[PDB]
Point group: D2
């Protein structure tokens, strides 16, 4: 609800299904602490990562396991993973969607931040 | 239903709302004939462009009026518009989503083609 | 020199070699008139399309023949071409680099505009 | 020479000048060790990060300091940085160009890998 991840595949023209996604929150000692994770669904979406109560301001990292995704499809990939790092800021009501568009040697990411 | 367009804004991190979208189908004489049009909604999506009966195989052009979108936001843009040209092919049941991610001097587009 | 095109391949992580590019300019009667054409080199770059004298103000369309590129590599891609449409030189001469990053179901384009 | 980074700005249509870039290499104990750093020139390019001798096999992370770039232009961007993580030189030496295209709420990255 506060945070959704969506992953698309630029080679096949499809959602990127069954991609592992790990979210971390930066701790006080600057290390990355596990926060939430899951696998994208048949629509390429990963819902239910967190709740409003749990998702406080801070620095988050979303790691998308692109390498395993490509290897499951039999395609040779460049990256280890894709990492999206951002600050969550409570500037009134907000929902964050982190979207990624994957190719073997490239990826694109955007944030769609809306007031629900 | 068979064809949806979604437009996102990379500068503001938001759906691209109220963007005009024109779809054309290539005619026998190679000209582009108007086929469907609309404006993206508050979610950046444009539904209801066509129906299964109307959307036959052929070459289609989706023109996204990016210049007017940026000017309504007070941002100076490079492109006249963004044009996505593709062939619709009846390889079993298919839904097409044409997605575009806009910046003033760049855009990205992908096709998400799924079997419903 | 005033207009260069660069094309990269996001599947292979390489320049996109031997990509045909056609440039058109909108004529007074609103049709697209041929302006220049060429193909990308081993570096993915296409230089020498035009000259400072010939590259006057106007609305230009750079058509990158992405389908032909993919088909020659044995791939069936989604798009027919990538088209980049922009007004050039409207505040005096500029140098334009039009870049494209290709995948079978997606492309991205950017413009770099410099004042010489 | 074996590792170059190029950064472009999708808002202005320009090279992204004075962008700080930090490269790390995974050490035997799985931590990220500093490897090289620099900043992009007026062309948006960063050359001379490393040498053929120093750029051995390994897992490398190229951190592009996009937030610092935007903040110096007076813009509040979404991401903290753009990180590009890849195994290099695993089948012998290659030349790598890591490119990034920046917007306030989005970025794209690609790799061009060539065999010298
Ligand atoms: C929020 O919802 C959506 C977002 C996006 C996107 O941000 C995106 C992101 C990138 C990097 C490229 C494109 C062309 C688009 C695509 C979607 N889509 O269904 O293709 C979508 O639904
Ligand atoms: C000028 O020279 C180059 C330009 C560019 C680019 O404009 C570009 C364009 C797009 C759509 C995405 C990215 C990440 C970058 C990439 C290059 N490259 O090596 O990936 C390159 O050499």
């Amino acid at each position: 609800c506060p945070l959704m991840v969506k992953v698309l595949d630029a080679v096949r023209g499809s959602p990127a299904i069954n991609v592992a996604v790990h979210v971390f929150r930066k701790a006080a000692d600057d290390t990355w602490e596990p926060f939430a994770s899951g696998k994208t669904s048949e629509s390429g979406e990963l819902h239910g990562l967190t709740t409003e109560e749990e998702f406080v301001e801070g620095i988050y990292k979303v790691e998308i396991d692109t390498k395993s995704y490509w290897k499951a499809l039999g395609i040779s990939p460049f990256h280890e993973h894709a990492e999206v790092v951002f600050t969550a800021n409570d500037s009134g009501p907000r929902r964050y969607t982190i979207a990624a568009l994957l190719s073997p040697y490239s990826y694109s990411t955007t944030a769609v931040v809306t007031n629900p």
